[PDB]
């Protein structure tokens, strides 16, 4: 439950929130092809967050 | 080359950089399973970045 472990998990949550925000922006730009890539990237970010949560979470 | 376009492209580049910062942290932790997913996530962020770059120039 170290500070290193908490830093890594917070970063994984942040990257997920970034990709969600970016997805909305690309949707707003109507940048369809990029939004679809980003949608997938966000799922993958969620997979990472979940894996980090299981391992580093309290 | 619109403003909004550039903000989006920058954020896509920022996210690519963040996956590498997390990858190194996961490496420091010997969190092998998480590191391999992160490695692939970087590959995926690079796919998105290059696509935005081709489009938003």
Curated annotation (Swiss-Prot), chain A:
InterPro entries, per the entry: Regulatory_Rop, Rop-like_sf
Keywords noted in UniProt: Plasmid, Transcription, Transcription regulation
From the UniProt record, which GO molecular function terms apply? identical protein binding
Q: What role does this protein play? A: Regulates plasmid DNA replication by modulating the initiation of transcription of the primer RNA precursor. Processing of the precursor of the primer, RNAII, is inhibited by hydrogen bonding of RNAII to its complementary sequence in RNAI. ROP increases the affinity of RNAI for RNAII and thus decreases the rate of replication initiation events.
What do we know about how this protein assembles, alone or with others? Antiparallel homodimer.
Name of the protein in its database record: Regulatory protein rop
Source organism (scientific name): Escherichia coli
The UniProt gene name for this protein comes to: rop
């Amino acid at each position: 439950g170290t500070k290193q472990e908490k830093t890594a998990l917070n970063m994984a949550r942040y990257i997920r929130s970034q990709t969600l925000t970016l997805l909305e922006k690309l949707n707003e730009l109507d940048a369809d092809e990029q939004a679809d890539i980003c949608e997938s990237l966000h799922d993958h970010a969620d997979e990472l967050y979940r894996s980090c949560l299981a391992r580093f979470g309290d």
